[PDB]
Design a protein around this ligand. Structure first.
Ligand SMILES: O=[N+]([O-])c1ccc2[nH]ncc2c1
Ligand code: NI
Ligand code: NI
Length: 330
């Protein structure tokens, strides 16, 4: 019930944070894993906003309140949590730094914020679940159910006293950035991804893709959102493999609920079907991750290291299937 708000101690502490100097170099690389630096995550986000958008872009106190309240509105679920938020924001930073002048100041600020907020108040349940069992959210939001909710949660946090980091935009730019954020969050609905990628592939291959065309820009930003949302698959193998453990902890807890309601879950959500996980991952990389990074690399060549890493992880899942797996810790 309701929107959580950070404490005075929380945001003032973030204000004083300084990013250890060794990390400045690493944070620029696509493969950077925030995993080992949990105390630093909010500070890492501040640093990225300041590098991409400038130290003056947002009033610092409002930005620190906003970030710490966002953190407090992610739930203690295994995967769709604060760590995932910051990981996705970092991928977006790396894409923006590598393609900086393709995007406007307003787009960079909107997209970094959109990434941090994109899974706000996730409960650990899929759109499939909310709609199968008529959760009130599915009645309010007939499609892209959770994504519409995440955007509503974002607006709710902006509306908290002292939290509106966008208030200094002109009335026009304010409307525009909220629309950038809305479209970007909605785009994280993987249901929309398949259509988006196919459209972009066609536009690219025929030569009609045009970044001065707003609808084209929206679609490219959409695919950037997918690429960032799934970026666990572009990390080093042990990081990818550990993250998969968290994703599945979430899926299996959902499957357990569907069994109580008399429906056998899809195998992916069935904790009694872990043997199917490697082939499930192969299917996901072939159907979703590989095509995504493939298209993103055609459109934004500097993003190629994401595709190379995704291919390397596809190879690792193939190794698992062939029984070649070596020692893993979890
Ligand atoms: O759609 N998803 O939520 C989702 C996300 C990541 C995934 N990895 N493997 C399957 C899979 C499904
Ligand atoms: Ni999501
Ligand atoms: Ni997500």
């Amino acid at each position: 019930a309701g929107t959580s708000i950070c404490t005075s101690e929380e945001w003032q502490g973030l204000m004083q944070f300084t990013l250890p100097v060794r990390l400045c170099k690493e944070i620029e690389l696509f493969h950077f894993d925030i995993g080992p630096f949990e105390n630093m995550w909010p500070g890492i986000f501040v640093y990225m906003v300041h590098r991409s958008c400038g130290t003056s872009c947002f009033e610092l106190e409002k930005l620190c309140r906003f970030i710490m309240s966002v953190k407090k509105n992610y739930r203690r679920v295994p995967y769709h949590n604060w760590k995932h938020a910051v990981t996705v924001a970092h991928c977006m930073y790396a894409i923006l730094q590598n393609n900086h002048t393709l995007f406007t100041d307003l787009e960079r600020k909107g997209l970094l914020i959109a990434c941090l907020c994109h899974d706000l108040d996730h409960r650990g349940f899929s759109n499939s679940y909310l709609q199968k069992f008529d959760h009130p959210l599915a009645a309010l939001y007939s499609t892209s159910t959770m994504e519409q909710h995440h955007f509503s949660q974002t607006v709710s946090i902006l509306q908290l006293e002292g939290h509106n980091i966008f208030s200094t935009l002109s009335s026009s730019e304010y409307e525009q950035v909220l629309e950038i954020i809305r479209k970007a969050i909605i785009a994280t609905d993987l249901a929309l991804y398949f259509g988006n990628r196919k459209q972009l592939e066609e536009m690219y291959q025929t030569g009609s893709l045009n970044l001065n065309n707003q609808s084209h820009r929206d679609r490219v930003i959409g695919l950037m959102m997918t690429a960032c949302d799934l970026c666990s698959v572009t990390k080093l193998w042990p990081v990818t493999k550990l993250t998969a453990n968290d994703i599945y902890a979430e899926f299996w807890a959902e499957g357990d609920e569907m069994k109580k309601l008399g429906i056998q879950p899809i195998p992916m959500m069935d904790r009694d079907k872990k043997d199917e996980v490697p082939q499930g991952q192969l299917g996901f990389y072939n159907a979703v991750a590989i095509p995504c990074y493939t298209t993103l690399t055609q459109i934004l060549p500097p993003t190629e290291p994401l595709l190379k890493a995704c291919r390397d992880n596809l190879s690792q899942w193939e190794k698992v299937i062939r029984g070649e797996e070596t020692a893993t810790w979890i």
